[PDB]
Structure formats: structure tokens, C-alpha cells
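ok posting inputs for the zinc ion job
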Amino acid sequence: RKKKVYTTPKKIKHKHRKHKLAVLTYYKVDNEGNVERLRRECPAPTCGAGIFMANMKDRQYCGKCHLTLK
Amino acid sequence: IDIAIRHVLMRQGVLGIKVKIMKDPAANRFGPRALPDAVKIAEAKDEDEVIPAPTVKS
RNA sequence: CGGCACCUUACGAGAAAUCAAAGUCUUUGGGUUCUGGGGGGAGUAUGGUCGCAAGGCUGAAACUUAAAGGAAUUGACGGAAGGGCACCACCAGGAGUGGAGCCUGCGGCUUAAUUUGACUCAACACGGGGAAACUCACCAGGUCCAGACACAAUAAGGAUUGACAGAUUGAGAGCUCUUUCUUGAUUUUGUGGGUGGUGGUGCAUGGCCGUUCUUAGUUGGUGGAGUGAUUUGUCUGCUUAAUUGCGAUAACGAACGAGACCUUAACCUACUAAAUAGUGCUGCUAGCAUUUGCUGGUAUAGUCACUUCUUAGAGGGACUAUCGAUUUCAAGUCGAUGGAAGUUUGAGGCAAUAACAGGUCUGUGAUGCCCUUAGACGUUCUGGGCCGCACGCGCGCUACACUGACGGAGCCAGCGAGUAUAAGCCUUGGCCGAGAGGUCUGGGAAAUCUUGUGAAACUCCGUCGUGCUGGGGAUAGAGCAUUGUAAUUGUUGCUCUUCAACGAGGAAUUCCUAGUAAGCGCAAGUCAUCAGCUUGCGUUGAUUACGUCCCUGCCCUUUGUACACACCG
Ligand SMILES: [Zn+2]
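and the output
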């Protein structure tokens, strides 16, 4: 019974930020060597080896179990 | 009296129906077998012959 | 004989109304004059003729139209008549309302929204609509897809979802923005397809409800009338609550509705039983007089009896019964007698033929169509609203004092409701609190306990003493609790204080005939809290009629109609 008129601008939903081969960054391969594991995979009892923290500013986080260090 | 109302789906709208059906009172086996005002008179047993004064000993 | 006519019947005529002529007319012919060929245009134009004129007489066509019209029938309507019924009419009364404040609703006004439906009865304490949140449909803000399914796009070198720190936001919404983490083919884009709406359309509908009208009305079978649609039955009179009966009768006998029927109230010492009801005895016990008497408690073993009262199941009981009258002596009615009941025994439930532009898409996963459908009119959550106030109106409650206020003392009803791992019911009994309220136990899933819901009017005893008084509790402040996340626009209560109009209500108008009206309280509902409201129940309990058509309304008949979409024609 009233034509809904807006004032605030349209808000746009977040799009998951895409990267090319994010798997590459977590490791360094050494000739005649083995895995590096440079991103400090989570040692919590919930998630085991192979999936890593997030080297943010002053914190390191993994989305699967919510915690940050330092 | 038992009734059943249904709305049969038409493309143009709703068509409601009612069906009212009576079992015959003589066909009832559970409640009353007739109407409240149904008065059924039995027929006369008269028109017999009476003789003056005998005695019947069996 | 002539006339003006009238009454009955219809051999006969007619479409019928009707007609002794409108008969002797498809069985068509006594003589003769005049006029008409669907409705309009139009008795108009023009010409002619008569007239002082007004006009008279004669008198078209173009064009336009599918009808106009006659008689009768059913209905509808009538500012027509005649009857009937009715406390949604009156008589005689009672109680009021309408005058003050206040709760609530309507319109109006304001508003950010003050959502809206409804306006004579049949709108306005109605939507069970007593709205903090939710309801909510509104307003200012913010999320979610909870967009199924077939495709085209993208996608493993990842289609994309969840997200720690900060920023922002009302928000500790990863809603978003910097942050680069994290799961992995569920899934991201466009279309088709949808899905959902307290969105519009109740004047597109269903269903339900209200109204006609709970009035008493409605219909066919055979027969009679009429060419027929239809009519009679289905009606002058009396009677009844009543189309219900008597009675009269071209009708006879039936069906629906009414009445019958069902639920509830009254009777049952007559049956059937009841420790979840009571009583009397008997024990065990307590008080007072001592008469052996009178009042309690206890007895789920006193291993008592009984159903009078309490409960319900099988029944009986009333059918105007008997008698006087009145009347058609009929249907009935009025006075007495008995009876539990003699008003339809009381009160309700159900309730006909078709119908209404009565109300509701704001109850439904009930729907057709229009709109939207991802920045959603879906949804969710935040803050506000329905309450908002110069105003008119309605349903009501307090009251206007003394048949009364309080303060003591007496102390009697009935309908009902109730929980377990909940998310909290009724809540006793005890213990605190002036109160409201607080604490600890128990019982009851239920004639057990809440609860004898020990209610108020009322009864008795004193204070007040006609004063706006101590009748009334509006306006307003402070403090104390409960309810709920959240009480501010005071939820609600309590304590103190504040001491408003109101001194009986103009014009109008409402309800009502016996446990009725009027007072007086209690329960269930909407409920986390809130009842001045309804729905029920019970206490006390009347005045006057038991008649009428004067007002009103409706029904029926007669009547009128150019209406039938039916006078809102
Ligand atoms: Zn981890």
C-alpha cells in the first residue's frame, strides 16, 4: 500500500577471494629433499597434519577450528 | 443422515459439493429403527365366533 | 306491443377480459356505407380548399427501427384497504440507559504508523481484537534463501560455503570492508520453471455465520378450473405458541417445516451399587452436668450394616387427569380437586422452499485472476504502534447516601481447572512479611488434594448524623513486590498521601411476565502479567398484565402496476 523507497545504497555480498594454487605456498621443495611445512600446520587434537595456519599480522589461524596464536 | 463435503479443483475456481444420503430406518441395526413419529398400528384380531356356554376338558 | 336496461347459463363466439350479441363466421355468402396493413417520422412537410383568425378537411416522402402493443399469470413493489402475531410493539408496571468520572469500541484529528474489516434494525466490550517482544498486516533500519527441478555459463591448476584481529553496524549479523585462512562439486551466473505472501479483488468464489426467520411457511400425487403460463388443494369463521386443529368446502388423501425428537431442571424412602460420598452403630477416646445425658476427633481392618440425603443406570411418573362451566358442543379455553409437576411441565440443541451483491480471500498446504517474488509485499531481528487528542456517539462500572458508609461478630452456594526432566499446573500446611509478596515441605494427572474453593450481598452489635460528611475514588507524588529477555507511554498489586466531578440525569429510548426482572458474588476463555468483557453458575428475590392492534415490524388476503436487473425499477 506504500511503494518502498530506499535511502541507503545497495550492499553487495562478499565473494570468496580466489588464488591460483594456494597449495603451493604452504611448502618448499628442496632438491634431494623432503617437505618443508613452512606454514606451521595445526597441532590441535581436532585437525592433524597437512593443513596450516594463516600467516596474518600478529596471528596465525586455521578456519576449521577457531583459534589464533601470538 | 451422513454427509460428505468436498471441493473439486477446477481451473476457474472452487466448486464445493454436498452429498446427503439416508439409510432406510428399517435398514438400521444400531440406533433407532424408525422415525420418532412413526406409529405402526397392529391389525384387528376380532371377527371370531363365540358359542353360548360349553366346557372344554383336555 | 314498443323502449332504457338488469340477473343467471354459455348451446355459440373470442387471445382473453368478456359477449343474448362481440352468437347464427374454414359447416367460410341477408343488403349496404366507412376505415386499417409493424412502430416511428407524422396527422408533420407541401399543394389545394373552407375560416376574420385560432384552425378544420384532404395529406406524403426521405430517413429510422425489431420490435411497439392487447389480454391474462406468477412474483416484486405501493406515501391503498382489510385482518393476524409479537415486551427484538404497545397496555400496567419494574429496572434502566441517555446527566459526572472512568475502562472499551466507532468516526474524526494527529501521526512514521496512529494497520484495518464493518455504519438502521442485521455497524460501534464485534473480528473471542483485554496489541511491551511475537502476534502485526504499519513505520525506520539489517540479514537469510529456506529460488526445488531441466538446461546454457564457470569449475579440480578448485564452482563455492563456513570464518579468528581490526574497521563499520544497534548488534559478539564473516552483512560487509582490509585480513589469507578453511570445506570441497552439496554447490556461483542467466532462463525456463517455480515457491510464498494479514497484498487487491467477499461486486470473481467456496465454506461458515447473520438476515428474511425461528416467523410459519413450502411442495408434489390423483381429481376440478383454465387453450395456456398457472390455479384449487394451501379457505369466510372459531381456536392454538404455531398451515394447529375444528369447521366450511371441487377437492381427497400426503410430504418437508412447526410439533414431535435430543440435552438439561424438577419426582422416586421403588430397584442397581458405591473406603475417591454420607449416616448410624460399635470400639478408642476427649470436654460440660454428673442421669444412663449433650458435642467433637479417630477406626483404607470396627475385615460393621444401609443408600434416606451425595453419584449415576435401568425404569416408572403428566396424558389438561376429574369436575363445573363457556363455544358451532367441535377444536379449545377459563375456574377448582389431586398431584412433584396443569404457563408448549422449565430452559435450550436441531431446525423448511428457494435467496441476499449482508460479512469474512485478516483461519486454513481453500482457491481463480492482477502485483511482487532476492534492495522480497516471504522470512527473520532490532526500536517504535495500534493507547496516540480541540471533538460527536454506544455497550457498562462506580456513585450520587441513612433500606447507608465503615469497624467488629454470625458464616451459608453452584459451574468448573490442574504436572514429570518439565522448562513448569492447582498449589494445601507450616514458617517470615502490615500488606502485596517471600521461604520449606507434601498431595493431586485427579468426587481423594488444591477446595466444604467457610463468596458477597445478607444477619446482629457500635461509630458516623445529612456536611459533597467518614457517600465517591477520579488527578497526582513517594516507597515496597510480583510477571516476563525487556514494564519508560506508570503490566498488575500493595502502603502512605493527593479528596475531582457526581446532591438522582433534558429530548429520546432499551430489556422484561416466575425463582423471571433486579441487586450479590465465584469459575473458564483469551493469559509469562493484566477482566470495569463475555460465557456459565449459584445466593436473596419482587411490581404489574396474562390483554390488544393504538405505535412499530413482519406475515396473509384483496387491490394497482407502463416494474421482472423487479422502486437502489
Ligand atoms: Zn586447527
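notes: The first strand of chain A starts at residue 61 and ends at 62. DSSP finds one helix and two strands in chain A.
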